[PDB]
Structures are given as C-alpha cells and as structure tokens.
Amino acid sequence: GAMGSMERASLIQKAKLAEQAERYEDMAAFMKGAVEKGEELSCEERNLLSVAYKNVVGGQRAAWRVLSSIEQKSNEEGSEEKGPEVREYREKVETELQGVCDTVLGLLDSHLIKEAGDAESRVFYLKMKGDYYRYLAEVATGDDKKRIIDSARSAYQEAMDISKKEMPPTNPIRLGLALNFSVFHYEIANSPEEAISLAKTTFDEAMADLHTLSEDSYKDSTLIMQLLRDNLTLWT
Amino acid sequence: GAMGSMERASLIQKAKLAEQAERYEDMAAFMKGAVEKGEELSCEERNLLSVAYKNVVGGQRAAWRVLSSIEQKSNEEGSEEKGPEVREYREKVETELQGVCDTVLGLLDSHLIKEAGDAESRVFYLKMKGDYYRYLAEVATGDDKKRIIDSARSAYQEAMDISKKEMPPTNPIRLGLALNFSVFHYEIANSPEEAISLAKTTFDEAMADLHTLSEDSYKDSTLIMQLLRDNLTLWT
Amino acid sequence: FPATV
Amino acid sequence: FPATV
Numbered sequence A, B: 001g002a003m004g005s006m007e008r009a010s011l012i013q014k015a016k017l018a019e020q021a022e023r024y025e026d027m028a029a030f031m032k033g034a035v036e037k038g039e040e041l042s043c044e045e046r047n048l049l050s051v052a053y054k055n056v057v058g059g060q061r062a063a064w065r066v067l068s069s070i071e072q073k074s075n076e077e078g079s080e081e082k083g084p085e086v087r088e089y090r091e092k093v094e095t096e097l098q099g100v101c102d103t104v105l106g107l108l109d110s111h112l113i114k115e116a117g118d119a120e121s122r123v124f125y126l127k128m129k130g131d132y133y134r135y136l137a138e139v140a141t142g143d144d145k146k147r148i149i150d151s152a153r154s155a156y157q158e159a160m161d162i163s164k165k166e167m168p169p170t171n172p173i174r175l176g177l178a179l180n181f182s183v184f185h186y187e188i189a190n191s192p193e194e195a196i197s198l199a200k201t202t203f204d205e206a207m208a209d210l211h212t213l214s215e216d217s218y219k220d221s222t223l224i225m226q227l228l229r230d231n232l233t234l235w236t
Numbered sequence C, D: 001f002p003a004t005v
C-alpha cells in the first residue's frame, strides 16, 4: 500500500517513534505496512501492532459513546427536534470505527493467523480477532449482529482452548484473554454469571501458580490479576 | 470543498458535537467548511474555529517537540548512527503541521480578516494570524525564517494597536493577545526583556480596571491575568 | 466501563 | 513551556 516503498525495519523504527510522540494513527499505519511485508511478527512487533490499533479504536469508541448518549437523549419525550445531524455524525464516527476494525480483522485474516503456529502468537492474534469483533458488536444493531457476536465468541473460544492447553495460568496473554472474554460475556453476550465465573476461576488458578515465577514475571501477572479483581468488584 | 454540500448551521452543530466528543480534526474540518460558506462568523463561531485548530496544531507541536528532541540526541557525539528515519518522521510531522498552519492562514486571508471591522473580530483574527505564523516560526530553519517571524510580529502588532485603541484593558481578547505576543517575544524573537515588560504592563493595567466589571467579567479577566503572572514567575 | 487489555 | 491561549 502507501507503505510499500519503506523498509520493514524503518516501518518498525517509525512505529516506535510514533508511540513516543503519541501519534497512534501514524503508528497503526506504520505497523499495517510492516504486516503487509508478509513476514511473521516477533513478540515486540505484535505488541506494537496491538498498541497502535487499541489506541486508535479506543478513541473512536469513546467518541461513539458520547455521540450515542446525545442521540439517545434527543429521542426522549420532551426533547426538541434538532434534525438529522446527531444521527449523521454518530454514523460518521461509527463507519470510521467499523473501517478500523475491518482493517485489523483483514490483517489477521491475510495472513497473520494462518501463519501463527506458536501458542503465544496464535493466542495473541485470536484474542485480537475476538476484541475487534467485540468492538463491531458494540455498535451493531442490524441483521448480522448475532453473527458478529458469534464471530467474537468463536475467536475467543479458540484462543481460550489453546491457552489452557499450552500456557501456564499466569501467562499474561492467557490472563488478558480471559479478562477480555469475561468482559465480552458481561457486556455483549448478556451472560454476567459466565463473566464472573471466568474472572474468578482465572484469578484463582493464576494465584496458585505465582510461586513458580521470577520477581519480574510475578509483577507482570499480578498487574493483570488486579484487573480481574477490579472487574469482579464492579460486578458483585 | 468536501463540506460544500452541508448546511452552514449543520456544520456549526456538528463542530459542537465534535468538541464534546474530543474529535478536534473533525471539528476543524466542520469549521473550515463553515468559514468557506463566505458569511462572517459570530463570536461563538470564531471561538469554535480557534478551539478546533488550536487543539489540532497543539497536538502536532507536542509531537514535533518529542521527535526533534530525539533527533538532537541522535546528533550528539557518541550517539550510534540510526539512519534517516528520525529525520524523515520529524519532517513528516513538520510538513503536516505547516499544512494546518497554512490552512488557517488561508482562511484568515480568504477572507475573514478583510471583512472583520469590529474590534473584537478583527483583533481576534489578527491574533490568530500572529499565532499561526508563530507556530511556523517554531519549526523554521531556512531562508524565510526571518520573514516568517516578521509576519507574526506584524500581525500581533496590528492587533495590539487596535486593542489598545478600541478595547478596555480587561477585555479577554486583549489580554490573551498580549499574553501570546509576550511569549512570541520571549521564545521566538529572543527578546525576553520585551516579553517581561509587556506581560507586567498588561497585568498592571488590567488590575486597575477590574473595578468596572461584573462578577462574571471579573472571573474571565482574572483567569487570563493569572496566566500573565505565571509566565512572569517562570521568567523572573 | 470494565477493564480490558 | 509558557502559557498561551
């Protein structure tokens, strides 16, 4: 694409500069270019990819929520008609958000997932696939909403199955997958009991494995375990 | 342009939604479209225009400073050669920043300034012209740098002359103009004494006029006066 | 909103 | 950096 003429290593270097400068759209474009070189991504590079797009879509999701809330208020009884503008602009933001999700899902399908054989890579990418279908589900209101939800579910479930077989219960990728799948259950699938069960079982199995870890690994795992606890506290 | 088919009022409404959603690039594009309708801007609309572009260029300036600092470090003795990437990416951000500045200066020249006859509008737009030439000066390193600096100076000076004749010393536009012109002197023109003199005289003349104001006007004026004081404290 | 990573 | 508005 636009990044076709830039060296892979230069794209990676510039993604890191973009991160330092908090230029996440640039970072994402650099990492898209790197993926399109066709080589597999290292661990560091996978995390650059995920950071970039998470920040871009995160901003779009926050904006969408603002606009949706305004739109909902406009449609209450007693609200003065303001014309089509709120809907139009929410739709604009929504369409851009869907585009970013489609771009990420496209990179995963062409061809990151199919070349990912190690558990750490494959689970990472399947978690991403679940996440970006979850973002699509957040804004879905039509005939395909069930199918979008099921696509998220299926990706998370495959990641979960691999992670349970191939990773220790304290592995940060495994933990973060479970955190997010739990939120999927609560917020998307209308399954709060499943969400709570998953978060609690994940926490407790991780706590039992902390004894095996170095100081630095312990720090990494306990950080995510605290997020599980934070959600459990929100939900109970 | 791209906004040619949207109603002026709809552009303004959407700029306000974009602000609520912290979508400043969208806000700026909406307000550019509104300006290009060719009608003068009200006070509220002028402030929408300025907020939008200030936030966009502010982000670009912060990113530029990060990248310039990295570039400067790369050029120190003992620094390992990293190739052209840091320079390239700083240049990319710089070019986009220059483009935004040129866009704003273009709106002012075609035709906001020439139609602005009231002091509050004319001073506001000339202050903007000074500000965006100042941003261009921050990144200027070539043959035109002196001319860019002089363009900022000239715009600020015209605004200053009108403001002193036509506005009270507590007028927020007058105060904010003086604040920014003072920073121009300190940071761009290598004139710290002029910067300090201007900030102090502006503060003291405003303090002497506060007695004429309502509670709400007093709040507005004293907020900006505190910024003058903050700079004076930084500089002395 | 709940925490995700 | 100094304050501007």
Ligand SMILES: *CC(=O)Nc1ccc(-c2nc3ccccn3c2Nc2c(C)cccc2Cl)cc1
Binding pocket: A043, A044, A046, A047, A050, A051, A120, A124, A127, A172, A173, A174, A175, A176, A177, A220, A223, A224, C005
């Ligand atoms: C190779 C690999 O992906 N390794 C790895 C391990 C941990 C994380 C990670 N660490 C922390 C700490 C606090 C908050 C979030 N994270 C993450 N993020 C993350 C991601 C991007 C994917 C899956 C799980 C987790 Cl926890 C990144 C990468």
Ligand SMILES: *CC(=O)Nc1ccc(-c2nc3ccccn3c2Nc2c(C)cccc2Cl)cc1
Binding pocket: B043, B044, B046, B047, B050, B051, B120, B124, B127, B172, B173, B174, B175, B176, B177, B220, B223, B224, D005
């Ligand atoms: C019509 C008009 O422009 N009126 C007006 C008055 C004050 C301000 C203003 N108020 C405050 C308060 C705190 C910080 C900044 N500001 C500003 N910003 C500002 C601008 C955008 C231009 C000139 C001066 C000032 Cl102070 C905006 C508009």
Ligand SMILES: [Ca+2]
Binding pocket: A007, A008
């Ligand atoms: Ca190559």
Ligand SMILES: [Ca+2]
Binding pocket: A091, A094, A095
């Ligand atoms: Ca839609």
Ligand SMILES: [Ca+2]
Binding pocket: A040, A115, A116, A117, A118
């Ligand atoms: Ca492989």
Ligand SMILES: [Ca+2]
Binding pocket: B007, B008
């Ligand atoms: Ca019209």
Ligand SMILES: [Ca+2]
Binding pocket: B091, B094, B095
């Ligand atoms: Ca340049």
Ligand SMILES: [Ca+2]
Binding pocket: B040, B115, B116, B117, B118
């Ligand atoms: Ca006029």
Ligand SMILES: [Cl-]
Binding pocket: A088, A089, A092, B014
């Ligand atoms: Cl729109």
Ligand SMILES: [Cl-]
Binding pocket: A014, B088, B089, B092
């Ligand atoms: Cl570049």
